[PDB]
Amino acid sequence: APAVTQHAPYFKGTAVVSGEFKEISLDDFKGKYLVLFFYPLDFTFVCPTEIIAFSDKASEFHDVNCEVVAVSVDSHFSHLAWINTPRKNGGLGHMNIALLSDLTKQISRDYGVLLEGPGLALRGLFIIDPNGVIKHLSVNDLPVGRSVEETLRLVKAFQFVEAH
Amino acid sequence: APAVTQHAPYFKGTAVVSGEFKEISLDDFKGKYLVLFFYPLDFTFVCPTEIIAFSDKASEFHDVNCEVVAVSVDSHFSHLAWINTPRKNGGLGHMNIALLSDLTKQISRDYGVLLEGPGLALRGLFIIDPNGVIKHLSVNDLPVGRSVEETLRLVKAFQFVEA
Amino acid sequence: DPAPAVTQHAPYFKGTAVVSGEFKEISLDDFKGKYLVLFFYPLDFTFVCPTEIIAFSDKASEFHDVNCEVVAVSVDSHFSHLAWINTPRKNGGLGHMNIALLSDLTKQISRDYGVLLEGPGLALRGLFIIDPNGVIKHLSVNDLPVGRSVEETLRLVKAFQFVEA
Amino acid sequence: PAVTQHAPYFKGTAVVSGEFKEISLDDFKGKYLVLFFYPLDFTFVCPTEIIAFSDKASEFHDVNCEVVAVSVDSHFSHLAWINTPRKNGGLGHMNIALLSDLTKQISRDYGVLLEGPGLALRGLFIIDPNGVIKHLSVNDLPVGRSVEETLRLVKAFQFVEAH
Amino acid sequence: APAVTQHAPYFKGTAVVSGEFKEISLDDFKGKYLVLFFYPLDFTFVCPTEIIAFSDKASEFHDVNCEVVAVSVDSHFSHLAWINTPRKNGGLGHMNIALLSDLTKQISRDYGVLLEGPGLALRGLFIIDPNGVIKHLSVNDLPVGRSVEETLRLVKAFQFVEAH
Amino acid sequence: PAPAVTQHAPYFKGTAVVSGEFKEISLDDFKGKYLVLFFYPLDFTFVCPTEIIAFSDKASEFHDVNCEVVAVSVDSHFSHLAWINTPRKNGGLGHMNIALLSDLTKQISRDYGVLLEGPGLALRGLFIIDPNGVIKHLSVNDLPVGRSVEETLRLVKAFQFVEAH
Amino acid sequence: PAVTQHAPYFKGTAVVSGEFKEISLDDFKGKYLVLFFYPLDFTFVCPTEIIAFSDKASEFHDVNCEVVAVSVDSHFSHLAWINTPRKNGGLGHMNIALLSDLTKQISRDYGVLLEGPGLALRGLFIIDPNGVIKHLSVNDLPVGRSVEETLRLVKAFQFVEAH
Amino acid sequence: PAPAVTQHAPYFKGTAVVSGEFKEISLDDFKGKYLVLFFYPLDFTFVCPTEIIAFSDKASEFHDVNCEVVAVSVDSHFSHLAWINTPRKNGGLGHMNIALLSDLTKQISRDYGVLLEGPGLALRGLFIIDPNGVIKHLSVNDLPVGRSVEETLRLVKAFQFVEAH
Amino acid sequence: PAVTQHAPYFKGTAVVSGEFKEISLDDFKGKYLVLFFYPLDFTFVCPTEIIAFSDKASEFHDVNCEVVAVSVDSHFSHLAWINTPRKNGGLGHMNIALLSDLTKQISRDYGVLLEGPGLALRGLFIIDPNGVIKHLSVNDLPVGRSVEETLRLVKAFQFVEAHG
Amino acid sequence: PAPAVTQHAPYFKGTAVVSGEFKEISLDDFKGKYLVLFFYPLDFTFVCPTEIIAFSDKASEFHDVNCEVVAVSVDSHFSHLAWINTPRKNGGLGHMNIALLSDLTKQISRDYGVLLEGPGLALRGLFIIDPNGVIKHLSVNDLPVGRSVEETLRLVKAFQFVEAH
Amino acid sequence: APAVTQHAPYFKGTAVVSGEFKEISLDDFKGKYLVLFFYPLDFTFVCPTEIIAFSDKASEFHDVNCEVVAVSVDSHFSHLAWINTPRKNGGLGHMNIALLSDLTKQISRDYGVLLEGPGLALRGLFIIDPNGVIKHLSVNDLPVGRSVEETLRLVKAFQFVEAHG
Amino acid sequence: APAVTQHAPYFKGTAVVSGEFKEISLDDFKGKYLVLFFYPLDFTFVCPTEIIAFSDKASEFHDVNCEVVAVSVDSHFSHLAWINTPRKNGGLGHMNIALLSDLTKQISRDYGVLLEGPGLALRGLFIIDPNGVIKHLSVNDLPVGRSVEETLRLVKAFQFVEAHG
């Protein structure tokens, strides 16, 4: 279930990883931390700020054994086309994080962030620990992006607790 | 599941029409022939040929009182972004037909062309008469494009059969 | 599981056909390992049907050349098929046939393929391209009065092969 | 359908004098009807009996009796068999109605349909002016019946209703 | 069942054969053609002409390997009494065919010819082949006579088919 | 309404031979009179006639006490007439002073509980039915044994006496 | 029960030669049996018949036939009625068994029980050596039957077996 | 209503011998009086008469205190009268000052819960029923053993006193 | 319970010769038992019958018959009534067992319990050596029975086993 | 309506001994007063009188604060009276200043949750019930142990103090 | 069940013992008497008087093999902080008895003292013997405190019974 | 439901507001933004930092039309006692925000943050708009606190969207 202290719902799908298509799953992240976050749609004005900021600070998450993965109900083909749109035209440009396709909408559904009527995800974020346990979640309404720095601080606060 | 001689399932959604977002529905085509065709996904290499072929020959359909509407499970932002990608670059360029978004997937479901596992449409095509009745349908597997010329021919053939 | 739908296995069928002026029982199993075009038409001795059927018979060897058999089906008996065959083309008939004319006398084949109109008791003009593994790759259905392009059907059969190569 | 019971309803398209005409049991109210079935157009076992009924048709008409032949073939098949000359195994011109039972419901309702192959046994019904069955007989597929015997029976039922 | 191409319903009963009581059944006729026909009642005047005609023609049937059996719901004692009444007195006089009693009415019921209301048989006729398969059946309403010659023609016609 | 003593006699209707003619009769026709209703198995057999002939010879003796006699079997009324027209020398019934009722449908024997379903004929039952239609007496014999007619008359009188005193 | 069927089982206490004895249907295999019912001990309507069977009992024995009288009274009422002299309206000495049907089951299984008043009609059954009913007759309560006729029938049934 | 102390006595109706005459009597006949209703197995048995005779001899004492006594068995009323008409010296009942009630259908013995169905006779129950039909006392003996008439009478008087105070 | 049927089993605490003793129906096998019920200790209606039974206990014992009185009172109430002098409305010394039916199940199993007030009707049961009920009688609450008559019945039942 | 603090006391009604007489009492009679309702297992046992006597001796101290006291066991009211009439010297109650309620049907002990079903007597429960019939305090002791009367009066006082202040 | 004579319901949870957190459960008290009492809430003005009186007298319970445990639905962190509040300021100060936390409310529920609406316990007290059997219970409404001396007297009286009669 | 875009579930309970006990509910905040946040337990080392940070910055929320309410499963008496403990000793000190008591646990349950096992809330936070619609929620595991500046920035971002785009 998508609640804190419970194991994260299993997921699998096609992601853009480094300009390439790869099938990824929750299993691939065992033994690291994972920030899994959702955004409504590719090619919309409100999303990319948050997605880019995550890409920019990705190295910082890697440094503490934390992976980052952005998800939307769009196809992996739409993801790539948007990654190949340069930031100066409201694209994403190169990405340091995976762009998971939730084309079936099942991932968003499993994480309790899918809006069924229009068929797209709220802005959910989950911090998942090395055993697949959810330590933190937050959800924002569509117009509002989150602070990437606060996410990083939380990953660190969680690791600190584990270490002590 | 839709069938020749049966009324076409109702549909409504956001289309890109002449670079802009418009709400469209089956009712908007009463009094006219409609070609409604589905393709899998935006930004794939198997589809632009068919969609481009249809857009190029669109006025020929307009001349015989027939609209053309292309449909995929992509959002209408994906549609517009693909329209705003030059053909030389593998995009759609300017479109003379509507591109309807089936984001909820319910239109593909209703037309019986939704593949539920991957969550995208088979290449269905439906010719619907001025009364909403399906005169012709065909469906191809994902990789294979159809002939626009043959679709135009069938339309005129159904019109000939009125007289 | 078998259904007259693209990506699904074609429903089994068996019946009496006219094959080279002779009665032969044939079935879906006879066509395993090759492509099959199975198409339905409403009725023997109607003016709307022979153009399409003759066009397939005329192109039959081009279909065989790309590993594709062609089988026409109506709900008429095999005796009707044979009489229409033995009516020359100059006389409104089918004349010589290079394809199988399957009888669906019980109408069950049309039913299983989803093209039977029960009320009047005949098929719509459906066509199914079935691959060597028995999987439907393409289907199309016309209302009764309208013939289809045999050229286009041949091009599609070629294209499905091209794509699996 | 047994003797002393009312004839099942039927309706269908018939070839009547080279033309397509919708006929039904009700068209025969007030007249005798010989309704007989044969298995299939264009088979060699059937034409001898159908032609014999055609040849002797006015003799039935003379005693207020109509003759209708029925098979599960379409009316287009019936017409092609009429347009085949007798010398060529055809029916040639007909003085009796050839009824099409394409749906098979008529043969089903008259109790003569063989479901497995989907064709009718060689059944014959004598139906009085009120639509009551006075007589019935059935032969296996290969064997034709005596027309003069059927005429004799018609005349004998008429004799009995008069005396 | 009593339908063309089906096997004839099994029957058994006491018949009058050449002035004597003999129990007969459908199995007795294996290897032979059988003409099995029904009439309504003994000692009535409408039934007799048909029956005498089959009797006078019996040898023509025997010559083509065919038996003839007349059936009514009467007892076998009635059948004998009727056979023992000279024709000149309106009886059947001597018979060359079997007269089978259907006292229980079960034979006429099984052959689909019994009028339940008065409990007598319609005039039905069945030609049954050597395997017990019905090839022809006909049922006239109670008064109307039928043709021995035509029944003979039909028997021969079925045999012709069986041979060529 | 059952074939049992103290109960009303089951209704009956059928064609009888009366004075050599056909007439439909029924239980109703005997209201106000006593009736002897008796059953025998089959016309034109050698065991039934003594009883029937004996009831006929003694018939006026029953009439003298306001009592009718009706004989019943499952034979048709045509069989009944032919047997009456067969002389007694020849095993027939000869002239009859009593009605011979036909129970062709077997339903009268069934209603009177005398029908043997196996062979489809009546046991030798006898019922004495009062002027109210009430069964005062029944007996039933196995097929090969005949009844004393004089005992039946005495029983009728006995019942009348009891009523009268 | 009916003629040509096996007699229903019975068992009960009978007065036999002035002693109580348990008898049953099994005791009479090999012999004929005349089993008859009367309404009630000590009523003026019954003794005549019962007496007549007693007087004639030797004749029945001479033809291998037993006679048993049955009523729903107890065997003590039977004995008391036997010990009542004939002039005083009793039965006096008996040559036949007098079976008590206290439980009413015997009258019930023989079809002669009047349920309302709880007593038997006057039925008589002739039962053969195999326990099969050959004859039955039933009288309303006031009317006695003929013992000579009953004896005639037993003899006639014996003649039919022997020839 | 049930055969239980403090409950209303079950309803009964049947034919009794009353002063050598047949009379139909019922529980209602006894309203406003005390009623001793006792059962015994069978007429003409060696055991029973002592009890019954003892009750008859003492009957007037019961009357003096407004109490009726009714003996019941499953015998017919004809048996009862024959037993009455049999002198005491011979094992009979002789003259009777109490009613002898027949329960030929056995329903009275059933309603009073004293019938043995297997043998079809009553256990020896005795019920003291008050003027409003309420059971004040019951006793049941096995078949062979008789009852004290004197104690029954004391019990009637005891209840009468109590029900007044 | 009815005559000819086995007495229902019972067990409980009795006052026996001024002491508390558990007794059951099993204890009376091979003996006759008179089991009688009375409504309540310390009521003016019951002592006469109880005292009379006790006064005649030796006469019962001499014929191999035990006598047990039962009420729904506790055995403590029974003992207190025993220790109350006869002069004062007590029972005085008792030659019979006084059985307590505190749970009321004994009275219920013997069919004498008045459920409304929760006390027994005056039922009496003569039980033979195999525990078969030979006699029962029941009186309404105000009326006592004759001890003499009970004794006579016991001796009569014995006479019948003994002779006929 | 249940035996729990803050709920209304279950309704009761029964016959009590009150000043040497039998009176019908119920929960309703105590409306507008405080009520101490206590159970004990059995009359005439050595273990209960000390507690009952101590309540009786202090009864006027409860009266003075508008509080009634009633003892309850499953004994009849006739046992209760007889135990009152037994001197204290002989383990009796002697005279009582409190009501002794009879719970002969055991339903009161049941409704108050203190009935031991197996032996069919009450545990030593006590309930302080207020003028509106609401339970303020309950307590239960195993059979062998008596409670302090002073402590029950202190609690009654304490609940009254809380009501006023 | 929380009924006298029944085994006490099992409980487990975190208590403050001697200024420290310890898991305790019913099994810990095997061999010992246990007074388990409940109070509504930490930091309210009603409870501390009883809790403090129990702690002051704890040595008298310990001297007769008896533990005392106080329970409320508060967390063990509240308990500790109440202990760490001076008595001067309505705190508990030093405790000689354990303060059990019933944060899930399940213990007050299992002991029948949970008020579900507000989510806190009535003032129930249970004396549980060395085998885990409830010998005595009591329950007061929220505003009234019990006498500790009387609880100690009961523990002693139960031990007296165990050792003699 | 506690999901973004849905209406916040109704709540009502006792809060400490400026050192006094006050009943508050969701209705009280209509027309204002509300930050409703949950913490596990009063008097724990883990929570005060975040509670104190919200209180220290309360005036920044007030100035953008936003109230802040903290919630736990502790009673309001524990809340008040934690307020009256000095910060130097692990206390909350003076609070500028309301501390809501969730003693029944129903608020934590309705907001989907109650850990049923231990009976305390996870660290959930909800930003609720003036119409009662949830705009943002976050939940942390028990040991980790949130940034109060990030909560305030979100309140401002939602207000900004509402005012423009």
Author numbering:
A (entry chain K), E (entry chain G): 1 to 164
B (entry chain J): 1 to 163
C (entry chain I): -1 to 163
D (entry chain H), G (entry chain E): 2 to 164
F (entry chain F), H (entry chain D), J (entry chain B): 0 to 164
I (entry chain C): 2 to 165
K (entry chain A), L (entry chain L): 1 to 165
Article, verbatim:
PrxIII is a prominent member of the ubiquitous peroxiredoxin family that function as thiol-dependent peroxidases with dual roles in anti-oxidant protection and redox signalling in eukaryotes. Like other typical 2-Cys Prxs, PrxIII employs its peroxidatic, active-site cysteine (Cys47) to react with hydrogen peroxide forming cysteine sulfenic acid (CysOH). The resolving cysteine (Cys168) from the adjacent monomer then forms a disulfide bond with the peroxidatic cysteine releasing an H2O molecule. In this paper, we report on the crystal structures of both oxidized and reduced forms of bovine PrxIII F190L to 2.4 Å and 2.2 Å, respectively and examine some of its novel structural and enzymatic properties.
In the presence of 1mM DTT, reduced PrxIII F190L crystallized with a P21212 space group. Twelve monomers are present in the asymmetric unit forming a toroidal structure. Overall, there are 6 homodimers interacting by hydrophobic contacts to complete an (α2)6 dodecameric toroid. In this higher resolution 2.2 Å structure, a detailed picture is revealed for the first time of the precise nature of the ring-ring interactions stabilising the catenated state. The major inter-toroidal contact area comprises a network of hydrogen bonds between residues Ser59, His62, Asp63 and Glu67 from chain A of ring 1 and Pro9, Tyr10, Phe11, Lys12, Arg109 and Asp110 from chain H of ring 2. A potential third site of interaction involving hydrogen bond formation between Lys12 from chain C and Tyr10 from chain J, as observed for the C168S mutant, is absent in the current structure. In contrast, with PrxIII F190L in its reduced state, the conformation of this conserved Arg is quite distinct; instead of facing the active-site thiolate, the Arg side chain adopts an average conformation inclined away from the Cp sulfur to a distance of 4–5 Å. Interestingly, however, individual active-site geometries around the 2-ring catenane display considerable microheterogeneity in this region with the Arg side chain adopting a variety of positions ranging from 3.4 Å to 5.2 Å from the cysteine sulfur. Interestingly, the Cp loop of chains F and G of the reduced form had to be modelled in the dual conformation with half in FF and half in LU. In addition, the new Arg123 conformation, together with the lack of C-terminal structure and the dual conformation of the Cp loop at two specific sites suggests that our structure is not in the typical fully-reduced form, but may well represent a trapped intermediate state.
